[PDB]
Design a binder for these strands. Structure first.
Ligand SMILES: Nc1ccn([C@H]2C[C@H](O)[C@@H](COP(=O)(O)OP(=O)(O)OP(=O)(O)O)O2)c(=O)n1
Ligand SMILES: OC[C@H]1O[C@@](CO)(O[C@H]2O[C@H](CO)[C@@H](O)[C@H](O)[C@H]2O)[C@@H](O)[C@@H]1O
Length: 580
DNA sequence: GCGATCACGC
DNA sequence: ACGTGATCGCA
């Protein structure tokens, strides 16, 4: 049964009521400088569809959009806000975002359209976007009557569902998490994405050219050492060269054949000179394909900026993710890849990049949640936590901790945060399951509060059905009750890890909100460009560095109050590389 | 188009 | 743990 609405030819006052469900539809997945294909408004006066060329040229409509006192309920308001920013139009007054609400209620539903959210509350009078638009090469905006009905049904769904979603959030003690954390964050992310990050494309191109030359040289050395040309990027053609023509040992298998992962190759290197060259080839090829070529493909040729999209409603722990480009995995560990960061530069003359990162926030969060006396004391002393962990688990003085001991203790600390298992620690350290289990036992002997936490959190997940973070983010773990050991064990590790990873996410999100407020209060021109889980990257005039050196770490350190201090390191420089 | 594999970040 | 995405190769 069709849904009634006015297919409007002009904007009227009744469309500009002080509460409405608003749809500002951007069908392109990447909404940067993208078309708005249609607008729907549902409010106390009825249901309306507006052509965007009409609405967005209308001064009254534009003023309504930008009026903070005119409240709008939406789904994925960031998409609309950014698309409107590209058109020089400010969207304000978004009081409810159904995407974020659905995400907080259950991130596992993978809600990514209104229909999916609606189905959570048995509301089915709206089509999935994929049904309307199609996907891939077949994707298209449909004719107006079909488009208009869809946008109106989405607006109608939002109008109906706001209350039951808010009611459930309130029951879960998550309504503040939506209204005071995620919704304000969405506006901040919209700003960051719209600002973009300036790229030194000539530098990337120069690196591209040098990598191409190095790739050619290593490629040829590989064919030489193999006495044969083949496709090095096929883990199957490669597996044949290595494990058949050259007869190398099969140390590890995949599901469909031989492993050629770097950890395996590193083990095979002593047998044949080809292996180190395959590794080198892989390193260079990663830089060339993913970073150089990948960045260059998405840089805007006019402004030479990249404009990531931070997916705020994807990860199961409350982290953001970043796409097109992913600016959360730019290399740093290896110097060769780290130089990619030299191409990320400030957007204005005489500005600098300022980067601030939490030091060991996940382990500090663990100390807090677990109330582990030893771990808390370690952070209260600002100890090197890996050296301290080695001291405790290997029962030596600080002076007796060797580099290998620190390395193994560090791995244990990661294992503990990730949700410890002897098999997984064993794989990481290239040791036996029994040896890994002894390490873990020693760790829990030294950190008995952490042990009690890991036990208790798994029991709580079983009892309640979910675990929660500091600011009341939730993750359901139905597999915690599985009688399949492997399935259950993965859920147990999620129980252990999610409050840690997710509370750290909560903290940095709050820090972003607090920081933006302080930046505005101080009228600094500095602004956020990126978040990389435990770090914030800003740019600012060079004249603001001294103020940022004090302000940014303070705001980040004070975002929450834990049983241990939070510590933030910071650096600045003329490129992201130099902000070290 | 999509799954397997691999490698980059935290 | 939690992510994105490149290439291959088989649809
Ligand atoms: N109705 C509520 C109550 C709490 N919280 C979240 C956000 C708060 O910052 C955090 C802490 O709650 P309390 O301060 O009440 O403890 O939990 C929430 O989202 N909604
Ligand atoms: O706008 C981001 C928001 O949209 C969703 C779908 O609702 O993801 C879409 O947009 C992403 C960014 O372009 C794409 O990566 C994704 O493939 C696309 O579905 C949400 O997941 C996201 O929060």
């Amino acid at each position: 049964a069709k849904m009634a609405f006015t297919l409007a030819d002009r904007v009227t006052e009744e469309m500009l009521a002080d509460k409405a469900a608003l749809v500002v539809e951007v069908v392109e997945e990447n909404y940067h400088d993208a078309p708005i294909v249609g607008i729907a408004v549902v409010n106390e006066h009825g249901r309306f569809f507006l052509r965007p060329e009409t609405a967005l040229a209308d001064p009254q409509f534009v003023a309504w959009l930008g009026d903070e006192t005119k409240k709008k309920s939406m789904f994925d308001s960031k998409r609309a806000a950014v698309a409107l920013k590209w058109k020089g139009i400010e969207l304000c007054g978004v009081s409810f975002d159904l995407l974020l609400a659905a995400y907080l209620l259950d991130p596992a539903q993978g809600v990514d359209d209104v229909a999916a959210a609606a189905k959570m509350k048995q509301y089915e009078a709206v089509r999935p976007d994929e049904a309307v638009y199609g996907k891939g090469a077949k994707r298209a905006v449909p004719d107006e009557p079909v488009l208009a009905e869809h946008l109106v049904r989405k607006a109608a769904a939002i109008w109906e569902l706001e209350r039951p979603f808010l009611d459930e959030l309130r029951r879960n003690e998550q309504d503040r998490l939506l209204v005071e954390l995620e919704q304000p964050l969405s506006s901040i992310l919209a700003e960051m994405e719209f600002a973009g990050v300036k790229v030194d494309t000539k530098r990337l191109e120069q690196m591209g050219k040098e990598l191409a030359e190095q790739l050619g040289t290593v490629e040829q050395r590989i064919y030489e050492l193999a006495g044969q040309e083949f496709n090095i990027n096929s883990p199957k053609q490669l597996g044949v060269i290595l494990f058949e023509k050259l007869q190398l040992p099969v140390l590890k298998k995949t599901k469909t054949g031989y492993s050629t992962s770097a950890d395996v190759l590193e083990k095979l290197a002593p047998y044949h000179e080809i292996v180190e060259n395959i590794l080198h080839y892989r390193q260079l090829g990663k830089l060339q394909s993913t970073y150089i070529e990948g960045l260059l493909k998405v840089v805007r040729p006019d402004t030479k900026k990249v404009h990531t999209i931070f997916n705020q409603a994807l990860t199961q722990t409350g982290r953001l993710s970043s796409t097109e480009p992913n600016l959360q995995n730019i290399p740093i560990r290896l110097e060769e890849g780290r130089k990619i960061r030299q191409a990320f530069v400030p957007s204005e003359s005489d500005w600098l990049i300022f980067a601030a990162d939490y030091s060991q926030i996940e382990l500090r969060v663990l100390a807090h949640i677990a109330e582990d006396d030893n771990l808390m004391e370690a952070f209260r002393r600002d100890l090197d936590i890996h050296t301290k962990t080695a001291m405790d688990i290997f029962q030596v003085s600080e002076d007796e901790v060797t580099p290998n001991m620190r390395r193994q203790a560090k791995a244990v600390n990661f294992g503990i945060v990730y949700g410890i298992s002897d098999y997984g620690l064993a794989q990481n350290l290239n040791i036996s399951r029994k040896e890994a289990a002894e390490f873990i036992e020693r760790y829990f002997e030294s950190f008995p509060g952490v042990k009690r936490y890991m036990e208790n959190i798994v029991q709580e997940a079983k009892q309640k059905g979910y675990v929660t973070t500091l600011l009341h983010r939730r993750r359901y773990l139905p597999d915690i009750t599985s009688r399949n050991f492997n399935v259950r064990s993965f859920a147990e590790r999620m129980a252990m890890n999610t409050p840690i990873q997710g509370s750290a996410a909560d903290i940095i999100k709050k820090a972003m909100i607090d920081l933006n407020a302080r930046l505005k209060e101080e009228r600094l021109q500095a602004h956020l460009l990126l978040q990389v889980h435990d770090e914030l990257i800003l740019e600012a005039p060079k004249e603001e560095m001294e103020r940022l050196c004090r302000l940014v770490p303070e705001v980040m350190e004070q975002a929450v109050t834990l049983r241990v201090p939070l510590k933030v390191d910071y650096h600045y420089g003329s490129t992201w590389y130099d902000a070290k």
